[PDB]
Structure formats: C-alpha cells, structure tokens
C-alpha cells in the first residue's frame, strides 16, 4: 500500500523532496548546560 | 548467507585421534595425614526453655567442622503431639568469629531449610534425629541430635581454622525456645511437670600433621563461605472475599545465591499450610473430632498445595521485573525440581539466582549490594473454602485456599548469600560487611 | 602406545585441592576427581575456551565415538 | 566498518604414525609445512610444485575464483601403473579419461573416496608393492589398527 | 593484499538477456526509447539515446562512482538506464532547437539521477556484504553491549574486617 | 558524507550489480500531468520546441 | 528481565566471576579408551543346596572384571511376613580368593550391616526387591534373585579386577549357603517340610579393552589400593533387667581401616537388630492378641525404632586411651551416617568413620591398627527392665533402658573395613601386606 | 494523530503527511502519478429509528439513523503543493 | 488435502525466491479461511452443526545449494520476470426474461 | 502441571542451545495434545461430559550472559555432543495361557547407542506396563468383590 | 449478559525510500528515549 | 489392532533421480490397494454377492 505512494514520484516532487536535506525520522535533541529549578519564600515587608 | 560454511564430508575422521585416559584403572589421591575426633564443650548459662546461653569452641584441634547440639527431651503428650521438637528448641544459633557475628540460623530456617534442600533417607534420618517418629508415648525420652548447617559444618572444604585464630575466639550463642510443641506446650496450654533440656554441645575436630598445620597456622587463608540473611514481616492476609496482594522490600546485600521463603502460622511451629479436615490436615482430621483450628502435629508438614496462601509471586530489581509472574506451585514444586532435585512441602518457596543453589560452588548470584530497589510481589489466593468440608477443599480451584489458611499471618523471608572469611596474623572477620 | 594415557576420573563424593594453589593449573578444572559442583570448559583470555591437555572437544569427542581411537 | 572474508580454507596438521609423519585420513597430503593437509573440500591452489599449479598433486582444478577454492579435495590423475593408465586399487576411476572431457572435469578423474592419505599396495609387478606414484609406508596386513599399506601422496 | 578478495567477486552476472542492450539487429535501441515517448525520430531523440550518447552515460556513471567513492562498478543494466533516460527525457526535453544546450541538460540530469541511486547503492551493497559475510555486522562487544547499571549504591560497599598493618 | 572511505573494504569490485532501479520513472509525463500517458493518437506525435522562456513569450 | 541481574556487577563479584576459570556452559569431554562389556555365566562346582560350600572359578573370557552377581531361585515356605531378605540370608558368605590367597570374604550379616549403613533411598529399595519378596507374595511363590557381590571390585569400574595381568593365578570365589533360611526352608527353629533346594548361578560382567589399553595390562606392572574387610563374632556381655552391662571387646584389626561396623543380634532370626515388642512390627503378631515377643515380624525384622536397640553409649580406645568422647549408642545409629554417608540406618546397627566420607572410594582418613598394639571397643548396655508385651512400656520408656527382650540379642558382630594393596606383577597377583 | 484538535462527527481524515495542519509538507502522495485512484466507503444500515432515543442512543456499531438516508451529498477535498513563480513581473503555478 | 500455491514461484525452480539474497527482508504468506466452506461446516446458508474446525499447515520446499551457486547468490544481484494476478470485484448486470 | 522437557539442553547448561550463535535459524517445539487423558476428559472408553479443555503455556529459562561471551558465542562455531531418542512401536508377540512367546524384533537403530529401553503395555491404559489383577493396587477395585 | 470486549492491534508504519531505508537497516542508531517509572504506594490513610 | 511401522533399509546404491514403491497383495496383479464393498472395489462390490 504505501509503497506506492513512494513509487509515485512526479516533477512536482522535487521542491519537497529532491536533494534532501532534512529527515523527519531522526531527531536531534541539543545538549543544554546543567541547571536546576527550586521555589523559594520570600520575606515580606511592610503589613 | 555469504558467510563462510564447512561440507564436513570427513569432519570427525579427520578429528580423530588416540585415547587420553581409561575407565578401568582409577589413581587415588595422596591425601594430607589427619585425625578426626568429637569434643564436647561447655555451655555457658543456664540451658532450658526459653534461655540463651553460649559456647566457646575450645582450641583442641587445628580445624573444626561438624557441630552437633545434642538435646534430650521427654514427651509432654502422646504420639502425633510433636514437630520436630529439637529443632523447634533450638530457636537459634548465632555464629561470632573474633566478635563479628558470621551467621546466624533460626529454627523456622532450619525447618525451611530441611523443607527445601534436605531428601529421601537423609531427610527422614534428620528427622529421627529431631523427633519422635516411631509412634513414641508421653513421657518418652529421646536425645535428639541438632546438626549445624553453617558453611563449615557442611564442608572439611571449609574447616574453620582455629589454629589461624589465635588472637581471636570463636563462638555459638543458641536461643532455646520458650515453648516446644508436645514438649512443654500443647498449643497454648503448658504441659503440666514438663521437664527442662539437657543439653549438650559437640564439636568435631581435625587434627592435622606438621606440614599442613603449620601452613593453616602461619598464612593468611581466604574461605568462600555462606551466610544467611533473614527477616520476618506481616503477610498481607487473604481472606474469603479478596486475593490480597503484597509489595515486600527485600532488605538484601551481597551476592545472593537464593531466596527462599514461607507463610506461617507462628502459633505452630512449622505450619506452613492451611488446616483442613482431610487426612492429616489438622488435628483428628477425617474424624467428627477434626478441628480445623488445630494441626495434627506430627503431621504438621505436606504437598497438598490447595492449602497454601500463594497464588502467584514475581521479584522485582530497580523496580522492574526479574522474570515473568509465575504461580506458587512454580516456586514450591518447580524451582525445586530444577535447582535441588528433592521434594519441598506445600508453603515452601524458592526462586534461585544459582544454576545449582543446593551446592557450595557458586553457580550464579545476584548481587544486591547494587540493587537499588529489591521488591518481592506476591498475591494470594482467595481464603473461600470450607475447611471442615474435604469436598470443598479436595475438588477446589488452582485460585482458592482453604478458610484457615488466613491464619498464616507471618512471613519469613530468607536469603543465602556468599561472603568471605578471611583470616590472618591470627584474626579474621568477613570480607564484606554489605 | 606413546600416549600419555592417564588413570581414570570418576565422581568423586569429596572436594580436593591439587597441593598447587598458587599456580592455577588447566588440567585440574576439567578433572572430575576433584571437583564436584559443575563441569565447564577452561576459558583463557578474552574469554576463550582453551582445551587443556588429554581432554578434548565436542567434535573430536564425537569422532572418537562414532569413527573410532587410534594406537 | 569491517572487512568482509573469503573462502579461508582449514587445514589440520600431519600427524605422526610410527618413524613417519602423514597427514589424517579424513584430509590430504596437500602442499607442504604451512598448509600440510586439507579439511575442506577446496584449497588454494598451492603455487610450490616440481613449480607449477597442479593442484599440487591429490586435488583439482574447478571453474571458479578465489584461488583459496579453486582445487577439489580427493583426486589425482589417470598417474601410468606398469603398462596401463589405470587408478589405484583403492581409487574410483571416474571415466573421464581426458578426451572425453573439458579441462576441469578432465583432471578429475579418480575420485579417492576413503583412501585421501593410504591406499593398499598393487599387485602389479608380481610383488605386491607400492604403487608407482605414492611413497612406500612401512606398513602390512598383519599390522594392526593400520590398513594403510605403502602409500603416500 | 585484498586483491584476491576483490578479484574472487564475478564480474557477471548471469542476468537475464544478459547483454540485454545492443547486441541485436531486430530493431535499434533508439527505437524501443521513441516507442515508449510516444515520439517521432528527431535529431534530439536520435542523438540523446543513441549508442554513442548511452555510452556516454555509462563511461560518467562509472566514472564518477569511481572519482567519488573508492569503488569500481559496472555498467549499469540498460533496461535500467533506458527507461531513466526516458523517463527523465519526457518529464523535461526543454530546448528551444539548440539540441546540443538541450542534451547537455538531459545527459547531466540523467548522470546525476543515476548517481543519487549509485552512489547509495554502492554503499548499501558494501554494508550488505559485511553483514551477510560476517556473523550480525562482523563487530565485537559494541553491539553485544549489556546495559551499564550506572546508579551508586555499588559505592557504598564496605570492608567487613581490617587486617593488622604489616 | 556518512561512510568514511573505508579503503579496507575487499569486495570493491561491484561490477556484478545492476544499481539503477528505474521504478521512479515508469509513466511519467512531461513535467506533472495526469493522463495515464495519454497514448491516444496512433502516430508519431513530434517534439513540440517548448524553450525555457519567461512567463510571455517576447 | 535476567539482564537487571548482569548489570548488578561490582567489588564483590570479583571473587565469584572476576577473571573467570570455567564457563558452565560449555562441557568439555574425554577420550576414553574403548571398550565392551558382556556378562558371562561362570559354572558352580559342588552341589548347591543348603548348607553346603560350593565355588566358582572366574574364566578369562574378557580383560578385566567388575560386577558379579549370583542369582538364586528359592521358593516362600510361607506366606508373606515370613521372609527378610532370604537370598542375603542364604548367601552366608563368599571367599575371594585370587592365586590361592584369601584377598577377602564377606558374610551375609555384613551384606545386611553394609546395606544398613551405606544403601539408601531406591538403591536399598531396588535391592530388598532382588533379595526379597516385597509384594505381599504368598507361600509356593517362587523368584529369581540377584545378590550382587560387594567386593573392592564390584563397586566400580575404577578396581576392575586385571584377570589380563594374571596369566598364572585364577580368581575363585567360594559361597557358602545357609543351613537354614526363615521362610524358605524353615520357620524359626522349624523346617519346613517340602522346602525346595536353591538353583544357583555366578554371573560375571566382563570388561573387553582395545589392543592399547590390554598391551598395557599385560606389559605394566599394577598396583591397586583397595579394601578388605575383618571380621570377628563376639558374644555380648548381655544386660538384664537389674543391670547395664558393659563390655571391652579387643578390636582385632590390622590395617588402615576406613571404618568400623557392628552390630547386636539374634542368631536365631537374620538380620534381628532389636528386641521384639508388642508394638506394630516389632515382633510376630505385634499390636493384637497373637502377639508374640519371642519371634520377629520377619517381613518387618528391621526398624529405625531404637527403643528396641539395646546399645547405650560407647567408645573406641586405642592403647588403653580414648580416642573421642564416649557417645549414646544413638550417636552412633544416628549422626554418624549423617555425617559421613547420608542415608538412614536401622536400629541396632552402629557407625563408627575413621574417614570423611566412608562411603567413597577415594581414602578420606584412615586408623591404621597396624599400628595401634591394642585397640578395644568400650560398650555399655541398656538395662531390659521394659515389659515388650505391653506396648505401652516400650513405647513410653527411657533413654537408659530397652526391651526384656532385648537379652535375646546375645551375638556381638564387629566388622572392620580396611585399605590394603593389591600387587600385581609377573602374571601373578596378591596383596602386599599380611 | 496529525491536527490535534476535535473533528465533528460525519467528516473524515486521511493524511498523508506527519503534519498535515502546518507548512511543511511532512509527506505528501502524489496524485499526478496515479493512474486511478479510487475512496471506496461503506455506509451503516439506516435502520435506527430517528424519532426514539432508545433506538438513537442504543444501537450497534454498524448501524445509524433512518434520517442518514438524507445524507446524499459527498464533498470529497484535498490539499496539495505546487509552486508560485514570480520572474520578471509576473507569476503563476509552475504546474497545471 | 493440499492446496498448492500458485504463486510464480510455486510454478518453476527458474523463479526460487532467493531467501539467501534477502538478508534484511521476509517473505511471509498470509492465509484468510473462509467463514465457511460447503459441505465441511455449511450447506448452503445453513451452518452444520457440530462441524469441526480445520487443521492447517504450511509446506515450504527449499533449495540447498553447493557452495559455488550459494556463494554466487549470496553475492550477485538477482532479477526475475514474474507473474502477478490483479483483481476486482463487481456486481453484473442482471438479465431477465 | 508443570511438565519438564527432558531433552539434552533441557538437562544441563552445558549444553545449553547458543540462540546468540543462530542468528539465521529459528528452534522450535512441536507439541502434540492427546485425544484423551484418562481421568480428565475419559474414563476408559467413555468420554466425560463437561470436561474442559486444557490450557496451556511454554515457558523456556534463558540465560543471558556478559559482553564477552555474548560477543563469543555470537561470533564463533559451536559443537555440541547431544542426546538423542530413537524409537519405534513393535506389536507384541502377545503369550497365552498355554505357551511362550518368543519374538525377534529388528533393532532399527543407528548411531552409538548409549543404551535401549523398553516396555510392554496395554495402550488403552497410560503407563500400564503390567497385567491387571484382583490383589491389592493391581487393578480397578483390586481386593474386594467390585 | 455483558458481552466480552474485541480487540484489535494496529501499527502505522513508515515505508523510506532507498537511500533512508538503508542507512536505518545499515547503520547504528542511538535514540534519546522516555521511559516510565511506576511503583504503587499504601497512602498512610487520614481520618476525621 | 495397530499402526504398525517399519524402518526398511534401502540397498540402492547410484545417484537416484527418484524412489518409487507400493504395497501390493502378491495374489492380484496390480492390486494396490484394500477391497471394499463399494463400487470397484472388489469382486461384486456394491450388492449381496
């Protein structure tokens, strides 16, 4: 079945597939610097 | 399937060659020159039901091995009124080298023990040794034999070497129950003039030559050994409405070779199943006396699976599954088969890490000094059957126990794990502490 | 027969160490007569399977049993 | 990634059978002191002869590549006996006498089924002895556990 | 080193018509490409598939597979590369009489589509070998790879005893 | 990019493969047309001079 | 899953799996010299019937030998109940004899004490059902019996015994029927009348080796360390109903013995351990009104009740000093086998290991009489105050005390099992020391 | 799976495309390639009584309303990718 | 009974399925039974009663090959000219009196 | 139940199947059900109404080794010296009352034979390897007048 | 007179083209992944 | 009674293109297979006699 959706290829394929560039099976995630969250009170001044 | 193939028309011809040794004509091994002799100890304290008292094993030979507590017991009651009493008495026994408890072994593990890895004709000789199995009377009198099963009252491979001790002392502190069954109580009713142990303990010792006593005496020696590790808990009761369920922190360490278990009803020493009133299910079982509160005790133990409490069990490291769930009946009936060879009784269970957990060698382990999270999930069966009616009890299902299998309330969870002892300059204690 | 055939090797009810603890010798571990837990192949390094000397593998163990031994 | 192999043929050692060295009886007396005798159906062509390919002596050619493959285990040659072109005793004459043949199916014609290392003696020259193209193995009837007689190839 | 290796792969394939292009009077080559266009004969069709243009492609397809990775191929099937060229010729064949600009463009477009599937071919057959040569990819204990426990309460093993100091 | 030339590989001898899998362009017609391939007229049907002109023509 | 153990790796597994020795999954083999094996009748000469001697001659149809057989044929004389092991009974011994020297001899008692002792479980069962009728069989009923031979070279395969080495000595072997045996031909004191004769038949297994291993045998010289057993009867310092008697018996052994053996008994009823009581199968009848105390349930002749053993305590001295503590006779029945065999042995019947594991063939520590000018074993008896006809008295009785009936059990039995050397040189074979 | 909102009952989705509700075609069949394509659908048994709740509410997975049988429009709609070319001053569809 | 397939490669040798050559590929087959068959569990419209289910197996004959055409298959790119059975239900036309 | 296999592989790990090794072929177990057990779903001959159908579940124990080995057995050839078990039915030349059988049965076997076993039985009766007969545990109701 | 439940599994799957399909059935992958940890807890119960 | 088996050793010797045998009763040529009362199956098949 979905092979012939592969097998089906026109001219009007080549703005959205031909010299690929990029794959929607693969995913890179980037590495981020080390951190970490806390929640913390607050003094309040005043009444 | 480029790979590259052999057609071995003549693979084996080619193989082939002369003989590299003969059936017919055994070599038997020189051997060191020792001597074998039993040595009674004294023992510290009072004996008697309920007291603690200890031993220290005098330095009279180069290494010890077998360790024997002899008891002598009369009969409070009649034939069927006794389980295996000695082993009941001795409640436990603690194993100290140089200060450091090594073991320790309670009487519930040397009854699961015996249940689990003991067979045949040397189970029923243990049992002669612990009990009264020939239809004996009250007031019978027998000296019982308790053997130790530390890693060194099993092996000579694992003789204890004294003489590599000598700044440090080895020990037994054994705790004698407060009540025996048949004995001194009857259930929970005393046993009117009942007498008080004679107790006695023996230790036998090795004496070895020059050459080999005086390498135990000077090096430093490393001994693969077994230690138990035990802890009891509260079983999530079954009852007649519910399969309850339980998630049990294995407090473990080391390098386990097993896990080894059962459900309890503490009351009666022994009583891993349910009461019923088929044949020696409980007390005047297949009578109008039955009562089904109240075990035949001399025949406390047995295969009928349909009163044990266990419906299916897993063991989870890290939280995750060590293998599929499997049924009770897996644990009691099959582990075994596979990893002993014996029989174990109905409310035995074993899961072993070990190719072959009944030996000393080790043959696989799990090491739980790097498992995060030890859990043992267990699910019981469905306490719906009418124990006072065989009918409901002999035709019922593979999910339902009987109503007094309730009464099992405690469970004892056990595991063997391997350590070493290490001795040298004169003392010694464990390799690992955990 | 220039073979160095050696005695026999049955199961024995007893453990027994060699006298030569601190070199580990190859033929001991296959040797029956000693042992009496498990039976496993000698592993060199790398984890290798190294036949010691008078036993022999599966293949020749089955060609000596069904083809024949030599003189 | 890694490289792909090739046939890798196997081949065992010659072993000692009593003041002479030869190879098993499930292999062949293949070439010489690296490869001494051969386990799989096919070798590599042994270049040392005399010199020359051929496939040395006890195996023959067959219509591939990757010299390792290229000689089949378990021939030789028609190899004259006394007056005829006859095989061993012990050898299969194939019937591909030459003419008949292509050069492949030409050289293998006798076929050494069970007798790769020792064939028996002939009686060719009235005296039962080794025949004309193998060494003379110091072996007889009454011998033991040996059916080999003189033969070598 | 590797040259029996490479040499002991056949360099023919038992293929069916193998040969399959040429090698035949019955009808030209030209004409089964006419047929399939739906096109009359015309200096840019007899030109772009004739023999010596088909030969061109071949010698560039090899060529540049050879300039580009460090594999030697083949010619490639031309039942293959006639039905490519076709294809490639119905979906452009712009030019505006200028039949050698026009040839130019579709030689480059056809060279070009055949490398986007030879070179990756190239490659897919040299990893297919490893594997169907080699036991699971022919790699050692990085794909036999256990999972690492990697958590610390290892590290809190402690020494049961402490000898005398010596 | 991906597959660093591996000049150890031995099989690069890769003449006995057939590559080119031309199952792309079966039935494709001049740029995106949907026609089936539209051979109707039993003739030759010329080459039609489309230039690659602007969108007018002069 | 089984992966979540693996990764569980650190310090404490380098001792079970750091660089690893073996892997469990791989079995490695060993060419063994090939060989055949085919039993082969030997002839009887002298006419078998009871009470007479006749003998065998072991011809050299194969190398080597190991197992030998003997079948008998014998009809009940009565019904079932009224046999014990009756083909071991009838086999009152058998001379082993090898160049005309006495290598050893065993008796008929010893086949009971050395089934006792080191058979167990289905081994002993499969044995009683070669020796014996255990299927309820009836008076008429005939079977064909197989009394294996327990001779150093009928235990393994390891002593066959070379008949290929010993061109000029034959190997004989001569057995001696019983004059009597209980249920066959008579019943008690009674014979039977009608009672048919034994047919008798010696079977040898014989070992075919190659042309190697049997050039070998003829062209080496051979040395083969093997056992032997001594054997004397005593008379028992029989105790009463007022006293415990006690006894020194000499030990009369030579040679470095692996154990010791014995026995009490009746010589009128084989294989009589114990006294006689009302107790179910304790005696003829036991546990109704046609009990009787002065004959045995012979088809329940042995038991493992020791109430019925007449033993109390003893001890083994060599040259007048002690060689271990003085232990209860149960000591002896009981853990010794525990400890160095591990099957059940029956009451009565008394171990005593100078080995680790006497059950073995490879020597494990020996006492060497040899050396040892005066050994002697110390017993003391149990006083027969209990009343055997009234089930109670036994049944409830003291450790201290037995049977009146157990003054029956006159016959004092002490078997020594030893090490000798088998030497064989010159086509002619026998033992190396005295 | 590819919008991620609500769809009413009585229209359906087919995609094509992992994303089919953004910009970037994410997969996308081309129809200009395929000789004959065909939706070929399956209609319920109208045999549910529109006017009981009972029937309405309480019938089977196969089945719907009488009053489907009104349902006798079909809009079948698709969305695609061409190209618009802008050069020198004008523009259009590169593909007709 | 058996059912042979039809398949091309059912029919002739010179179409075998090159399992050799299919390394990263299967080749499965997948069989739908009918709800009912005439006669075995049906007659005409109506079910028979007490009619037992089918016992199913499938026979696959295989190749095994020498080791100069193995090789050759394992290395070698290979093509075959095939059959395939398209198809289409429809209802008729009806005719009449 | 829990019935054990009791082939080769399934006695001891060190002869345990390398399934790291076989990376092309598959290992398989064919199980064939009875028709009939006798007490669950007959009673001799006849079948017992309300019988239910087993259920059944295949459970294999894995052993999952280290890196190294793993990467061994995956890479290297393995030879196992197995068991095998060759069999064959033989009709019995059934004895009777007034004489004794003999027979000469062909042994069909082939390789090297560790041993032969065998038995007679009354197919109809699982496990029955003897006569029947009114003494106690021989038979049906054995010792009394049923 | 419940009716018991039909289930049915179905998977969607990504058919590559040539030159993707063999580098996924070429090459090794590593793929950042989520996984679920779950333990149940008894909850100390509260009360009035 | 029995399905009886059988384990024939085959003393062929040459490369075999193909194996071929049947059962037979020796007394009638080219019987193969059993006789029945159903047509052509035995003398008479299908009535009384």
Same mark, same amino acid.
């Given at each position: 079945?979905?092979?012939?959706?592969?097998?089906?290829?026109?001219? &009007?394929?080549?703005?959205?597939?031909?010299?690929?560039?990029?794959?929607?099976?693969?995913?890179?995630?980037? $590495?981020?610097?080390?951190?970490?969250?806390?929640?913390?009170?607050?003094?309040?001044?005043?009444? | 399937?480029?790979?590259?193939?052999?057609?071995?028309?003549?693979?084996?011809?080619?193989?082939?060659?002369?003989?590299?040794? #003969?059936?017919?004509?055994?070599?038997?091994?020189?051997?060191?020159?020792?001597?074998?002799?039993?040595?009674?100890?004294?023992?510290?304290?009072?004996?008697?039901?309920?007291?603690?008292?200890?031993?220290?094993?005098?330095?009279?030979?180069?290494?010890?091995?077998?360790?024997?507590?002899?008891?002598?017991?009369?009969?409070?009651?009649?034939?069927?009124?006794?389980?295996?009493?000695?082993?009941?008495?001795?409640?436990?026994?603690?194993?100290?080298?140089?200060?450091?408890?090594?073991?320790?072994?309670?009487?519930?593990?040397?009854? #699961?023990?015996?249940?689990?890895?003991?067979?045949?004709?040397?189970?029923?000789?243990?049992?002669?040794?612990?009990?009264?199995?020939?239809?004996?009377?009250?007031?019978?009198?027998?000296?019982?034999?308790?053997?130790?099963?530390?890693?060194?009252?099993?092996?000579?491979?694992?003789?204890?070497?004294?003489?590599?001790?000598?700044?440090?002392?080895?020990?037994?502190?054994?705790?004698?129950?407060?009540?025996?069954?048949?004995?001194?109580?009857?259930?929970?009713?005393?046993?009117?003039?009942?007498?008080?142990?004679?107790?006695?303990?023996?230790?036998?010792?090795?004496?070895?030559?020059?050459?080999?006593?005086?390498?135990?005496?000077?090096?430093?020696?490393?001994?693969?050994?077994?230690?138990? &590790?035990?802890?009891?808990?509260?079983?999530?009761?079954?009852?007649?409405?519910?399969?309850?369920?339980?998630?049990?922190?294995?407090?473990?360490?080391?390098?386990?070779?097993?896990?080894?278990?059962?459900?309890?009803?503490?009351?009666?020493?022994?009583?891993?199943?349910?009461?019923?009133?088929?044949?020696?299910?409980?007390?005047?079982?297949?009578?109008?006396?039955?009562?089904?509160?109240?075990?035949?005790?001399?025949?406390?133990?047995?295969?009928?699976?349909?009163?044990?409490?266990?419906?299916?069990?897993?063991?989870?490291?890290?939280?995750?599954?060590?293998?599929?769930?499997?049924?009770?009946?897996?644990?009691?009936?099959?582990?075994?088969?596979?990893?002993?060879?014996?029989?174990?009784?109905?409310?035995?269970?074993?899961?072993?890490?070990?190719?072959?957990?009944?030996?000393?060698?080790?043959?696989?382990?799990?090491?739980?000094?790097?498992?995060?999270?030890?859990?043992?999930?267990?699910?019981?069966?469905?306490?719906?059957?009418?124990?006072?009616?065989?009918?409901?009890?002999?035709?019922?299902?593979?999910?339902?126990?009987?109503?007094?299998?309730?009464?099992?309330?405690?469970?004892?969870?056990?595991?063997?794990?391997?350590?070493?002892?290490?001795?040298?300059?004169?003392?010694?204690?464990?390799?690992?502490?955990? | 027969?220039?073979?160095?055939?050696?005695?026999?090797?049955?199961? #024995?009810?007893?453990?027994? $160490? %060699?006298?030569?603890?601190?070199?580990?010798?190859?033929?001991?571990?296959?040797?029956?007569?000693?042992?009496?837990?498990?039976?496993?192949?000698?592993?060199?390094?790398?984890?290798?399977?190294?036949?010691?000397?008078?036993?022999? #593998?599966?293949?020749?163990?089955?060609?000596?049993?069904?083809?024949?031994?030599?003189? | 990634?890694?490289?792909?192999?090739?046939?890798?043929?196997?081949?065992?050692?010659?072993?000692?059978?009593?003041?002479?060295?030869?190879?098993?009886?499930?292999?062949?007396?293949?070439?010489?002191?690296?490869?001494?005798?051969?386990?799989?159906?096919?070798?590599?062509?042994?270049?040392?002869?005399?010199?020359?390919?051929?496939?040395?002596?006890?195996?023959?050619?067959?219509?591939?590549?990757?010299?390792?493959?290229?000689?089949?285990?378990?021939?030789?040659?028609?190899?004259?006996?006394?007056?005829?072109?006859?095989?061993?005793?012990?050898?299969?004459?194939?019937?591909?006498?030459?003419?008949?043949?292509?050069?492949?199916?030409?050289?293998?014609?006798?076929?050494?089924?069970?007798?790769?290392?020792?064939?028996?003696?002939?009686?060719?020259?009235?005296?039962?002895?080794?025949?004309?193209?193998?060494?003379?193995?110091?072996?007889?009837?009454?011998?033991?556990?040996?059916?080999?007689?003189?033969?070598?190839? | 080193?590797?040259?029996?290796?490479?040499?002991?792969?056949?360099?023919?394939?038992?293929?069916?018509?193998?040969?399959?292009?040429?090698?035949?009077?019955?009808?030209?080559?030209?004409?089964?490409?006419?047929?399939?266009?739906?096109?009359?004969?015309?200096?840019?069709?007899?030109?772009?598939?004739?023999?010596?243009?088909?030969?061109?492609?071949?010698?560039?397809?090899?060529?540049?597979?050879?300039?580009?990775?460090?594999?030697?191929?083949?010619?490639?099937?031309?039942?293959?590369?006639?039905?490519?060229?076709?294809?490639?010729?119905?979906?452009?064949?712009?030019?505006?009489?200028?039949?050698?600009?026009?040839?130019?463009?579709?030689?480059?477009?056809?060279?070009?589509?055949?490398?986007?599937?030879?070179?990756?071919?190239?490659?897919?057959?040299?990893?297919?070998?490893?594997?169907?040569?080699?036991?699971?990819?022919?790699?050692?204990?990085?794909?036999?790879?256990?999972?690492?426990?990697?958590?610390?309460?290892?590290?809190?093993?402690? %020494?049961?005893?402490?000898?005398?100091?010596? | 990019?991906?597959?660093?030339?591996?000049?150890?590989?031995?099989?690069?001898?890769?003449?006995?493969?057939?590559?080119?899998?031309?199952?792309?362009?079966?039935?494709?017609?001049?740029?995106?047309?949907?026609?089936?391939?539209?051979?109707?007229?039993? $003739?030759?049907?010329?080459?039609?001079?489309?230039?690659?002109?602007?969108?007018?023509?002069?």
């Amino acid at each position: 079945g979905g092979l012939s959706q592969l097998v089906a290829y026109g001219a &009007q394929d080549v703005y959205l597939t031909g010299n690929p560039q990029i794959t929607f099976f693969k995913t890179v995630y980037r $590495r981020y610097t080390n951190f970490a969250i806390e929640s913390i009170q607050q003094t309040i001044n005043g009444s | 399937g480029l790979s590259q193939l052999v057609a071995y028309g003549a693979q084996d011809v080619y193989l082939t060659g002369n003989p590299q040794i #003969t059936f017919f004509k055994t070599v038997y091994r020189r051997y060191t020159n020792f001597a074998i002799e039993s040595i009674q100890q004294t023992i510290n304290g009072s004996v008697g039901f309920g007291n603690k008292v200890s031993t220290q094993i005098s330095r009279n030979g180069d290494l010890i091995t077998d360790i024997v507590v002899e008891f002598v017991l009369t009969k409070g009651g009649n034939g069927g009124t006794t389980y295996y009493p000695a082993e009941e008495l001795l409640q436990d026994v603690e194993l100290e080298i140089g200060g450091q408890r090594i073991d320790k072994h309670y009487n519930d593990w040397f009854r #699961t023990y015996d249940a689990l890895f003991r067979m045949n004709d040397d189970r029923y000789n243990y049992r002669r040794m612990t009990d009264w199995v020939n239809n004996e009377l009250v007031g019978a009198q027998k000296r019982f034999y308790v053997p130790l099963i530390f890693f060194f009252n099993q092996t000579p491979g694992l003789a204890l070497p004294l003489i590599a001790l000598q700044y440090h002392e080895v020990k037994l502190y054994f705790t004698l129950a407060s009540q025996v069954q048949g004995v001194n109580y009857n259930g929970s009713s005393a046993i009117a003039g009942a007498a008080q142990p004679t107790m006695s303990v023996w230790v036998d010792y090795i004496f070895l030559d020059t050459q080999e006593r005086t390498r135990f005496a000077q090096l430093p020696h490393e001994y693969l050994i077994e230690q138990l &590790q035990f802890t009891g808990s509260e079983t999530a009761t079954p009852s007649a409405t519910t399969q309850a369920s339980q998630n049990i922190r294995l407090n473990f360490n080391h390098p386990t070779k097993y896990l080894a278990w059962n459900f309890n009803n503490p009351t009666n020493y022994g009583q891993y199943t349910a009461l019923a009133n088929i044949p020696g299910a409980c007390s005047g079982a297949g009578t109008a006396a039955a009562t089904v509160t109240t075990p035949d005790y001399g025949n406390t133990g047995t295969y009928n699976e349909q009163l044990a409490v266990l419906d299916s069990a897993k063991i989870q490291l890290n939280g995750q599954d060590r293998f599929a769930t499997r049924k009770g009946s897996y644990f009691n009936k099959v582990q075994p088969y596979q990893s002993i060879g014996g029989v174990t009784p109905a409310g035995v269970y074993l899961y072993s890490f070990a190719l072959k957990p009944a030996g000393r060698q080790p043959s696989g382990t799990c090491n739980f000094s790097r498992i995060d999270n030890a859990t043992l999930s267990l699910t019981y069966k469905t306490c719906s059957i009418d124990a006072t009616s065989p009918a409901a009890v002999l035709g019922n299902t593979e999910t339902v126990t009987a109503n007094t299998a309730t009464l099992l309330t405690a469970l004892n969870i056990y595991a063997k794990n391997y350590n070493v002892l290490r001795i040298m300059s004169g003392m010694g204690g464990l390799a690992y502490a955990n | 027969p220039s073979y160095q055939i050696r005695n026999s090797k049955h199961h #024995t009810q007893l453990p027994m $160490r %060699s006298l030569n603890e601190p070199p580990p010798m190859v033929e001991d571990l296959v040797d029956e007569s000693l042992f009496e837990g498990l039976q496993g192949y000698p592993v060199d390094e790398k984890l290798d399977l190294l036949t010691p000397p008078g036993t022999a #593998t599966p293949s020749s163990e089955w060609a000596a049993i069904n083809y024949g031994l030599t003189n | 990634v890694v490289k792909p192999q090739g046939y890798k043929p196997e081949f065992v050692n010659r072993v000692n059978f009593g003041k002479f060295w030869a190879c098993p009886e499930g292999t062949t007396d293949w070439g010489s002191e690296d490869k001494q005798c051969l386990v799989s159906q096919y070798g590599p062509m042994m270049w040392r002869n005399k010199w020359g390919w051929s496939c040395p002596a006890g195996s023959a050619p067959n219509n591939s590549d990757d010299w390792n493959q290229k000689c089949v285990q378990g021939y030789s040659m028609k190899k004259l006996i006394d007056g005829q072109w006859r095989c061993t005793d012990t050898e299969i004459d194939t019937g591909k006498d030459w003419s008949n043949s292509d050069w492949f199916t030409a050289q293998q014609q006798c076929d050494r089924g069970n007798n790769k290392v020792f064939t028996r003696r002939m009686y060719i020259d009235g005296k039962w002895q080794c025949p004309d193209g193998t060494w003379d193995t110091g072996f007889t009837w009454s011998d033991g556990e040996n059916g080999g007689k003189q033969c070598k190839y | 080193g590797n040259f029996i290796q490479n040499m002991a792969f056949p360099t023919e394939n038992p293929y069916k018509l193998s040969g399959d292009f040429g090698n035949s009077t019955l009808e030209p080559t030209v004409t089964a490409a006419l047929r399939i266009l739906h096109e009359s004969p015309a200096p840019f069709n007899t030109e772009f598939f004739s023999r010596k243009n088909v030969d061109f492609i071949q010698k560039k397809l090899i060529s540049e597979t050879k300039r580009y990775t460090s594999f030697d191929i083949g010619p490639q099937n031309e039942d293959e590369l006639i039905m490519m060229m076709a294809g490639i010729y119905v979906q452009d064949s712009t030019f505006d009489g200028n039949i050698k600009a026009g040839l130019r463009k579709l030689n480059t477009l056809v060279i070009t589509e055949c490398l986007k599937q030879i070179l990756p071919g190239v490659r897919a057959y040299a990893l297919y070998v490893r594997d169907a040569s080699l036991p699971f990819s022919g790699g050692g204990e990085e794909a036999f790879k256990r999972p690492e426990l990697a958590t610390l309460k290892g590290s809190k093993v402690l %020494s049961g005893f402490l000898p005398l100091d010596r | 990019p991906e597959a660093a030339d591996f000049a150890q590989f031995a099989p690069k001898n890769l003449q006995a493969q057939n590559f080119l899998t031309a199952t792309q362009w079966i039935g494709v017609n001049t740029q995106g047309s949907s026609l089936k391939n539209a051979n109707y007229d039993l $003739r030759a049907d010329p080459i039609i001079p489309k230039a690659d002109v602007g969108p007018w023509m002069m």
